Design an enzyme around this catalytic site. Structure first.
Site, short mmCIF file in Angstrom:
data_model
loop_
_atom_site.label_atom_id
_atom_site.label_comp_id
_atom_site.label_asym_id
_atom_site.label_seq_id
_atom_site.Cartn_x
_atom_site.Cartn_y
_atom_site.Cartn_z
N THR A 1 0.82 -1.17 0.03
CA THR A 1 -0.14 -0.07 -0.08
C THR A 1 1.04 1.01 0.05
O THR A 1 1.88 1.40 0.51
CB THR A 1 -0.67 -0.11 1.28
OG1 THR A 1 -1.93 -0.89 0.96
CG2 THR A 1 -1.61 1.27 1.49
N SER A 2 0.47 2.24 -0.86
CA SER A 2 1.02 3.56 -0.66
C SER A 2 -0.17 4.46 -0.56
O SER A 2 -1.01 4.70 -1.47
CB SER A 2 1.86 3.85 -1.81
OG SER A 2 3.02 3.01 -1.90
#
EC number: 3.4.25.1
Lengths: 231, 192, 220, 193, 119, 220, 210, 196, 193, 196
Positions: free
Chosen positions: J1-2
């Site tokens: 995830t970013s």
């Protein structure tokens, strides 16, 4: 159970008229130097500063507890600004109680705490408690990595209680600032930016923010070549 | 090591050394013997060995071998300092897979007459084995430099007896050697 | 243990405390930790004493033999290289942590060696349980232009910080000074800050307090 | 576990060894002799790990017999016990130690003295007036410490052994199926009841 | 739960509910006991006799309880007494004494005179 | 999470015929670091009772706090009647055993006068077993201290010099000053040989006249 | 440690050592391993000292309450069952106990119950408990008689503890002797094991190995 | 540790921080991580200091032998020797090496030898604990055939960020510049690069 | 370990239980009775963990006695064994299980039949002509499978029990110090040799 | 995830990748990680999807109660409720939340709640596995009071690098823009942001 975001060393020192306490402004996230504006010296009134190391979430919980304690002390107490203000010793005993109870419930606040202050009689207060509820006093106190490096330097100034009346605020502050510099040289989780608080029985609390470690020496590094035989 | 128990102490005096040990051989809590002397000698050099009794025996036999060959080659008995070096090198040769022992060397150099002890050349007193910390307390309280041999005997004997009384795994009698360049006296002590 | 090394304008100082410990017990109050590799090459060890002694003895022997073979004064880089390669061969199982200092025809040198065989050069170094206190002093007082006397003062102050603040360190300060173009100056018990006060009484027993079962003379 | 007991009396050494052999759930044998004669006046009894004990004892027996043939002479019980101790002390450092505890009873015909040596698997050797391995001493040594006399005759020694065995049978929870008793004296080795 | 103070003092210091419990006893069928030197005899003056057994209940093999008053209440006391007798015999190593059992039953009755929400 | 630590420290109770001594070093340590050189471990709890709870210092502090509170409550509900040392010992047992399954990790000693006026020392395990003793050492250097006191106070293993081991050296009255001298020498030797034994010795002396405090500097 | 109790015509002898140890360190030579529950009941501490001392003192309190309620001395069986039930309620919590409850009542006579942390409750004539128990059994089984004199029974107890003290490093210090009678227990004093050892070694001629 | 090597128009620049840590203690604040194995072949070391020093000494020895027998080694040859050591000892040795070198025919070359002992020729390489934080920056800011000055700035900025974020990185920024002209060593102090 | 054995013959149930009690290294007792009478014609023997066995058996005994007082009647051996099974089956799910294996021998005076129930600590109940727990069956069941006859008299049952005990004494390595033998029949419970 | 949130002149923009992974398998390539807890209070979730969804639902419930009793919650109040949940359940819940919101008095505010449940008010925040790779880039490129367009570009570039380097990040870039004008959702596809 496991500390995540952590503050690092708090260092402190009695002097003839008061106490000095300093802590850097860094929240590290393991080796990541993630948060750089974390104040870790919490003033409580004009006579006490609480320096906190360790888990920042538990630090924020303690800061909430201390604000609540000031509010409760003001209730039905017309002398809460006077002879029935909170003393450093009251704040310390409350914190030590909380810490030891939390330890005994196997749910520690993962902190080391130094309470610095001046009692209403003018006595210097300087006492440590950790996550175990272990408490002790000394003319110099340091948490964490500062216990190993700052205490030797501060003890070269205040080795025994009879050194306290000989030690001025200028000497003590210089010693604290140099110890912060040494920690910046040698603690991989330190910041060059720190806060310092002075609690004087005459001049009160002076809280110095956004201090920076200065006059570092690095130029000798030019001469270092390889790891043994590289010319 | 502690399986067998045992303690050795040595002290220097005025032109003398003392070395003393307990006599118990154990197998954990079971006492096996009170005839297991821990102090050996190779000419005028005395070696106390505490620790695992099989290693005590093996090392005594090995140092007998080495000091006999030394005397045959050198045509002189080994001196305490040389013997200390020999012990050190022989034990470090098993740096991996050690002998589980604490040697104590005592003697008087034949040429200089200087009293010597090692466990270094910590000249006052040397302590080994299970009651080591009791022995350190006793000796550090009782010891005085330049004791005459009779006072050295009293001092080392009281150190051993009172330390042994607080160690479960050592005792059932003690032996004290008082060593002079001309004369060695062995004494047996009762324990209570 | 506290050991420090300090380079100065024409040489290097190494210094050590003299306490040897067996756990919490002081086994020897005056252990000599500064060991000669060669006349002007000296080492000091933290970690287990026997490994420091043995590796120092072996390396000193080979350095002396190599000096005889080459007809040259030994070099600190040779002691370093031989220690490094020996310790790497033993993959850190030789628990020797060393400061190596010396003088040779190429000048003054100061190195640390870790048990795994890693080395670094420095102008000032510390090792052992007192290393943090000593380094705090070194970081606050070291300078590039140290004289001999300043470097001796600094090194002994750093050892004193170890002595007062580290439980594993105590008793005396030993110093060795290696100036370029001079004999090494070993200063055994350069400081003795920890002399025991006299006891409140003598504990010499009267002769005969100890019960003796029997006596015999031993032939030797 | 096995019981081996020894008593050195004035004239002789008595060795007593339990007859049971147990594997897992069952007593396989009730008649096993846990001894080997090392020489005409030296007997060794052994206890410990299955297989190790007999392999060790037979290796020792072969070596002492070889010495006797080579020299045409009998080793003292002292020399035998020193040799056995050396072999056990080696084995501790070997890749698979002999887990074997022995008693060596011999009659020294040069000294005209009985000798009893106890050697543990570590190679801890001790000459003793009486001896035991494992838990047998825990029950028997107080009887021996109370009653043993160095000038005991063989018959008094055997009666004291009977008391020790009765005490083991009372208090020790295993059934060891009794003991074989051997006597070593100036006339050699004989088996007794 | 229900905790009403049912047994309370009247102004003359009587506890009417205990007096009325005694009236229930007095209306109840007789019981008689006569202790001799070596025995105690207990007696009483379309029903199926087999399954309308003696009013005299064993509490344990050595001790016997008769009663007068409310039969259903007596079953509760008898069951408690039997349980206590077996409990004493279990936790200690002896059967109850007659006085121990009597004291236990009298304690149960007393407690129900001083406990909220119970008759 | 480990709820326990070791803070070092050593304590010594000696009962005299008309006095009691409770002594402790003042150094607080964590591992090889000094936390404080003067953190007193021996407390006057009132009623001429002195107490020390050596070991994990948070549990020792907590036990002392609870005992002082028990003394206050005893006064409240006994009209300030003096608590007996024997009743204090029983109460401390109950305090400790109430934590049987998460013990106070401390060796406790209390000292005072019995109701005859003789010195009394009681010692407690972490769980609350207790014994009246003539003397007890506790903590890290107890093994360095007590054998010497056994030898010098009880003349243990000392025989009358001419009797060749037939006659014991007879027991005799030690003054509190002689006891204090022996305590000082014992702690000085423990300071020499045990790295945890502190920078100062604090002695509380209980007599009919009350509690008095003596302090002596130790090395470092 | 070594503790023993045995029944005889004179009642019960209780004999115990006084050694306490922490590893190799001798923590005390003078521990009281007999708990005087009341003038008529003794208990022997051989498990954890704190558990035995605490719970047998509480047992004394329960005996006193029973006596007040019932107007009679409590039985030794009742006392031992009170203790064994308490200990069983803490089974697996880690109590460490191994005690002989010894008493002499008119109904029971001289009675010993062994009680264990595991909840074992055994009546018996002879029990030895602790690390030296096998040595004590070795003497006692060799020498016990019911018709033994009181002085001979006290000597036998002392000698069985001495045998353990010689052979078991964790036993020694001194011997405490008690004699339980119908009228209550009698303390027969403290005997230092070293003095006793060298006495018996000369007088009896035993321990010839030493 | 934060180490870089960057090819540019005239050659290659190696960059490193100077921090060596043992846990949170900085054991050496002025470490030189840029190790010469040949006159114009240098390596940046990351991972175990003992392993990487031992490897670099062995490579220097092998390349000295190569030079005396076969003439000047290529940077690819040095990378191959590093590979053979790292790969054949991959179980014992925790060594992530960057190898950089210059020769007049190939100009500057960079080889990275990650853990496991694969070799990757790259126009630039980043390695060490602090490289994680600058992958995005370097990808956005690298371009082929920068000038010396642009490349020095690129390394200074990248390593300044790696030092800002990684506690295991810090001290001085050291650089070695390899070109036809020679070997040049550069040093930048915190009061220079912390202003970036 | 403990031996409990049971044989249901034509007229009676015979229960045999080992006398030893062993704690650690020592036989503490050689005379222990591992049974409790649950009712005048019902006997339970038990084996298992120290303390658990007697606590369980006495709790059961108290409950069956309470039932008998409340009803003035004796439960069948069937009902008793069902109750004991239910208590054991609960205990498996409890916070500390009774590690207790039982044999229940009773004489049903309504059926005029002997009954023998084996119940393990799990609460596995089985009515059997003869029964054992632990290793005692491993040595005894082949004798019982060979020789047992349902019409055996009590005396034949006792002789078969003697053969089983002799076989245990031969092959089982522990010394269990013999057995106490109880007989349950129409006349109640008696102890026999 | 970013995940990101960035304050700017007119307010705050939240950004996320859309990849959910189970090991190396992409269980959902089009995840929406931007969760509304109040009309102009949104969060970015990272860590355990179950924990963060449960927390976000509980926060939305508590803030709906707050709204009906006490009026509109501040972003600080939402962050406090998140804190109380994350902190009191820190042993069970692995939740790193970014909380972002707008109000006309405070404008855009960003709060990050890392693991452990500390709260940090910041001018921008980055979180998730892919944030590691863009710390340097974001520190070098963030500036106060960017325009909407500059801020969208800054998020797009940063997340494009985080997707380039982190295998656990990818798919579309989603954004939510919070201002006085309202709430605006943006989406950027790989063929837009992979060209950057």
């Amino acid at each position: 159970q496991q500390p995540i975001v952590t503050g690092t060393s708090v260092i402190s020192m009695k002097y003839d008229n008061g106490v000095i306490i300093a802590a850097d402004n860094l929240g590290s996230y393991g080796s990541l130097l993630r948060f750089n504006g974390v104040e870790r010296l919490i003033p409580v009134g004009d006579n006490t500063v609480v320096g906190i190391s360790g888990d920042i979430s538990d630090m924020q919980h303690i800061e909430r507890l201390l604000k609540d304690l000031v509010t409760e002390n003001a209730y039905d107490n017309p002398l809460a600004d006077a002879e029935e203000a909170l003393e450093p010793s009251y704040i310390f005993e409350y914190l030590a109680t909380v810490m030891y109870q939390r330890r005994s419930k196997m749910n520690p606040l993962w902190n080391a705490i130094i309470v610095a202050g001046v009692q209403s009689n003018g006595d210097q207060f300087l006492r440590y408690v950790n996550l175990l509820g272990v408490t002790y006093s000394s003319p110099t106190l340091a948490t964490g990595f500062g216990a190993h490096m700052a205490n030797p330097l501060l003890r070269k100034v205040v080795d025994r209680e009879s050194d306290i009346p000989k030690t001025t605020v200028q000497v003590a502050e210089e010693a604290i600032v140099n110890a912060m510099r040494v920690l910046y040289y040698r603690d991989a989780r330190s910041s060059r930016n720190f806060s310092l608080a002075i609690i004087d029985k005459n001049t009160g609390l002076t809280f110095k923010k956004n201090l920076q470690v200065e006059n570092m020496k690095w130029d000798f590094a030019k001469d270092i070549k390889g790891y043994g035989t590289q010319k | 090591s502690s399986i067998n128990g045992g303690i050795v102490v040595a002290m220097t005096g005025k032109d003398c050394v003392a070395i003393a040990c307990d006599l118990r051989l154990g197998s954990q809590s079971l006492g096996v013997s009170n005839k297991f002397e821990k102090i050996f000698h190779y000419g005028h050099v005395f070696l106390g060995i505490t620790g695992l009794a099989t290693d005590v025996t093996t090392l005594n036999e090995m140092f007998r071998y080495k000091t006999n060959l030394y005397k045959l080659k050198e045509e002189r008995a080994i001196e305490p300092e040389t013997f200390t070096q020999l012990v050190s090198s022989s034990l470090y040769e098993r740096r991996f897979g050690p002998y589980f022992v604490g040697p104590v060397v005592a003697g008087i150099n034949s040429k200089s007459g200087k009293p010597f002890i090692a466990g270094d050349e910590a000249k006052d007193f040397i302590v080994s084995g299970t009651a080591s910390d009791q022995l350190f307390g006793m000796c550090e309280s009782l010891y005085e430099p330049n004791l005459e041999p009779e006072d050295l005997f009293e001092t080392i004997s009281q150190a051993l007896l009172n330390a042994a009384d607080r160690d479960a795994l050592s005792g059932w009698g003690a032996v004290v050697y008082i060593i002079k360049k001309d004369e060695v006296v062995k004494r047996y002590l009762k324990m209570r | 243990t506290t050991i420090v090394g300090v380079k100065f304008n024409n040489g290097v100082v190494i210094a050590a405390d003299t306490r040897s410990t067996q756990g919490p017990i002081v086994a020897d109050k005056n252990c000599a930790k500064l060991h000669r590799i060669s006349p002007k090459i000296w080492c000091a060890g933290a970690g287990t004493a026997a490994d420091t002694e043995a590796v120092t003895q072996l390396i000193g022997s080979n350095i002396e033999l190599h000096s005889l073979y080459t007809s040259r004064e030994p070099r600190v880089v040779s002691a370093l290289q031989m220690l490094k390669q020996h310790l790497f061969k033993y993959q850190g199982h030789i628990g020797a942590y060393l400061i190596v200092a010396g003088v040779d025809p190429t000048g003054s040198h100061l190195f640390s060696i870790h048990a795994h065989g890693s080395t670094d050069v420095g102008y000032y170094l510390s090792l052992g349980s007192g290393s943090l206190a000593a380094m705090a002093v070194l970081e606050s007082h070291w300078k590039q232009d140290l004289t001999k006397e300043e470097a001796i003062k600094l090194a002994s102050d750093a050892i004193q910080a170890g002595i007062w603040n580290d439980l594993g360190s105590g008793s005396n300060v030993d110093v060795c000074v290696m100036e370029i173009g001079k004999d090494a100056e070993y200063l055994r018990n350069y400081l003795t800050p920890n002399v025991r006060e006299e006891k409140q009484k003598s504990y010499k027993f009267p002769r005969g307090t100890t019960a003796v079962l029997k006596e015999s003379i031993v032939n030797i | 576990m096995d019981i081996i007991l020894g008593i050195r009396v004035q004239d002789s050494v008595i060795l007593a060894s339990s007859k049971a052999v147990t594997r897992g759930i069952s007593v396989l044998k009730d008649s096993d002799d846990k001894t080997r004669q090392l020489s005409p006046h030296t007997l060794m009894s052994f206890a410990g790990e299955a297989g190790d004990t007999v392999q060790f004892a037979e290796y020792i027996q072969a070596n002492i017999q070889l010495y006797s043939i080579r020299e045409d002479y009998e080793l003292s019980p002292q020399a035998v016990s020193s040799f056995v101790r050396q072999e056990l002390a080696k084995s501790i450092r070997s890749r698979r130690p002999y887990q074997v505890n022995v008693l060596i009873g011999g009659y020294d015909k040069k000294k005209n003295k009985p000798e009893l040596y106890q050697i543990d698997y570590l190679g801890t050797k001790v000459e003793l007036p009486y001896g035991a391995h494992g838990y047998s001493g825990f029950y028997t040594f107080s009887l021996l410490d109370h009653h043993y006399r160095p000038d005991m005759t063989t018959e008094e020694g055997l009666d004291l052994l009977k008391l020790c065995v009765q005490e083991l049978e009372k208090r020790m929870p295993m059934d060891f199926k009794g003991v074989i008793v051997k006597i070593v004296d100036k006339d050699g080795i004989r088996q007794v009841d | 739960g229900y905790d009403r103070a049912l047994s309370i003092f009247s102004p003359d210091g009587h506890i009417f509910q205990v007096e009325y419990a005694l009236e229930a006893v007095k209306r109840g069928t007789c019981a008689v006991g006569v202790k001799g030197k070596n025995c105690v005899v207990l007696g009483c003056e379309l029903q199926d006799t087999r399954i309308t057994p003696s009013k005299v209940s064993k509490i344990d093999s050595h001790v016997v309880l008769s009663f007068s008053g409310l039969n259903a209440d007596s079953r509760i006391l008898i069951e408690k007494a039997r349980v206590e007798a077996q409990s004493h015999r279990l936790t200690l190593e002896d059967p109850v004494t007659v006085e121990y059992l009597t004291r236990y039953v009298a304690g149960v009755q007393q407690r129900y005179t001083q406990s909220g929400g119970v008759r | 999470f480990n709820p326990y630590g070791d803070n070092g420290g050593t304590i010594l109770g000696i009962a005299g015929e008309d006095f009691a001594v409770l002594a402790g070093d003042t150094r607080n340590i964590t591992d090889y670091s000094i936390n404080s050189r003067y953190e007193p471990k021996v407390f006057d709890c009132g009623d001429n009772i002195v107490m020390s709870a050596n070991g994990f210092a948070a549990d020792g502090d907590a036990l002392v706090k609870r005992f002082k509170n028990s003394v206050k409550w005893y006064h409240f509900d006994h009209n300030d009647k003096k608590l007996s040392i024997n009743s204090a010992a029983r109460n401390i047992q109950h305090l400790l055993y109430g934590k049987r399954f998460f013990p106070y990790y401390v060796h406790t000693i209390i000292a005072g006068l019995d109701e005859d006026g003789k010195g009394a020392v009681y010692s407690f395990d972490p769980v609350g077993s207790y014994e009246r003793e003539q003397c007890r050492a506790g903590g890290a250097a107890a093994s360095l201290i007590m054998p010497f006191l056994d030898n010098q106070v009880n003349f243990k293993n000392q025989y009358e010099p001419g009797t060749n081991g037939k006659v014991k050296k007879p027991l005799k009255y030690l003054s509190v000053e002689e006891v204090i001298k022996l305590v000082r020498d014992s702690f000085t030797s423990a300071t020499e040989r045990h790295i945890q034994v502190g920078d100062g010795l604090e002695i509380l002396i209980v007599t009919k006249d009350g509690v008095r405090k003596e302090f002596y500097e130790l090395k470092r | 440690t070594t503790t023993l109790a045995f029944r005889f015509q004179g009642g019960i002898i209780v004999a115990v050592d006084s050694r306490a140890t922490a590893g190799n360190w001798v923590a005390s030579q003078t521990v009281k391993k007999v708990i005087e529950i009341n003038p008529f009941l003794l208990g022997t501490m051989a498990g954890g000292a704190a558990d035995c001392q605490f719970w047998e003192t509480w047992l004394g309190s329960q005996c006193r309450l029973h006596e007040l309620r019932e107007k009679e001395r409590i039985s030794v069986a009742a006392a031992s069952k009170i203790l064994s039930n308490l200990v069983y309620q803490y089974k697996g919590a880690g109590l460490s106990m191994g005690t002989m409850i010894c008493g002499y009542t008119r109904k029971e006579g001289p009675t010993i119950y062994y009680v264990d942390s595991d909840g074992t409750r055994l009546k018996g004539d002879i029990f030895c408990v602790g690390s030296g128990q096998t040595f004590a059994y070795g003497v006692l089984d060799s020498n016990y008689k019911w018709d033994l004199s009181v002085e001979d029974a006290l000597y036998l107890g002392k000698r069985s503890i001495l045998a353990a003290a010689h052979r078991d490093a964790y036993s020694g210090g001194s011997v405490n002797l008690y004699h339980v009678t119908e009228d209550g227990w009698i303390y027969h004093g403290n005997h230092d094991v070293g003095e006793l050892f060298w006495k018996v070694k000369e007088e009896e001629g035993s321990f010839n190995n030493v | 540790t934060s180490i870089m090597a960057v090819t540019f128009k005239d050659g290659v620049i190696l960059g490193a921080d100077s921090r060596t840590t043992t846990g949170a203690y900085i054991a050496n604040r002025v470490t030189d991580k840029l190790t010469r194995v040949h006159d114009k072949i240098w390596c940046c070391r990351s991972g175990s200091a003992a392993d990487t020093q031992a490897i670099a000494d062995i490579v220097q020895y092998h390349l000295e032998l190569y030079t005396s027998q076969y003439g000047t080694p290529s940077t690819e040859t040095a990378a191959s020797v590093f590979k053979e050591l790292c790969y054949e000892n991959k179980d014992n040795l925790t060594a992530g090496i960057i190898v950089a070198g210059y020769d007049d025919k190939n100009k500057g070359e960079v080889y990275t030898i990650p853990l496991g002992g694969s070799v990757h020729k790259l126009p630039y390489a980043i390695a060490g604990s602090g490289s994680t934080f600058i992958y995005g920056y370097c990808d956005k800011n690298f371009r082929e055939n920068m000038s010396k000055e642009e490349t020095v700035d690129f390394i200074k900025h990248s390593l300044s960020q790696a030092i800002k974020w990684d506690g295991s990185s810090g001290g001085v920024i050291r650089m070695v510049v390899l070109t036809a002209a020679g070997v040049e060593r550069l040093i930048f102090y915190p009061d220079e690069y912390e202003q970036l």
